[PDB]
Design a binder for this molecule. Structure first.
Ligand SMILES: CCCCCCCCCCCCCCCC(=O)O
Ligand SMILES: [Cl-]
Ligand SMILES: [Cl-]
Length: 174
């Protein structure tokens, strides 16, 4: 009876790009189809004076046949009418790395502790998501405090994803 239509999902009110800048460690991920980033995922967000948000990311990706590389990725965000909803053009510093353009929603954050991100790459015909991914980020690479963890769990459930995350390990691979 809970609403899993993407159009129903709340996102961060009055999202502040500047406050969101800096280092975010991925603690957990819900994978899309054909998953790319595997683990050791760290993102760096910036805003320029134009107010244009961008990011870089490092992580282990596993090219099939069991070949691990540390991907170095770049993203730039185009604003929409909602301050928390963006279009993210992304690519790798190496041209053979995955590129594309995904929706990028900041579902919730308190800026200095946790963030929940969401992307629906493809809708179902009933408005639910056919192919989604989601990152939970922490400022502290050692994880979230309990109050933040509990808030995040609520947000995960609201996205209809709470059963579908896996933990992201950080072990200096990159
Ligand atoms: C959304 C993660 C951080 C945002 C920083 C954008 C920098 C490019 C990251 C590329 C994400 C594309 C792969 C995401 C889906 C996946 O890993 O399976
Ligand atoms: Cl709990
Ligand atoms: Cl669960």
């Amino acid at each position: 009876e809970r609403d899993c239509r993407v159009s129903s999902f709340r996102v961060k009110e009055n999202f502040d790009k500047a406050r969101f800048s800096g280092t975010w460690y991925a603690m957990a991920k819900k994978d899309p189809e054909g998953l790319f980033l595997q683990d050791n995922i760290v993102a760096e967000f910036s805003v320029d004076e134009t107010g244009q948000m961008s990011a870089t990311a490092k992580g282990r990706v596993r090219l099939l046949n069991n070949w691990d590389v540390c991907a170095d990725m770049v993203g730039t965000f185009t604003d929409t009418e909602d301050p928390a909803k963006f279009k993210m053009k992304y690519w790798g510093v190496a041209s053979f790395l995955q590129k594309g353009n995904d929706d990028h929603w900041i579902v919730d954050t308190d800026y200095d502790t946790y963030a929940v991100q969401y992307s629906c790459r493809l809708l179902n015909l009933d408005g639910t998501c056919a192919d989604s991914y989601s990152f939970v980020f922490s400022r502290d690479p050692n994880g979230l405090p309990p109050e933040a963890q509990k808030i995040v769990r609520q947000r995960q459930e609201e996205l209809c994803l709470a059963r579908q995350y896996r933990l992201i390990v950080h072990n200096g691979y990159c």
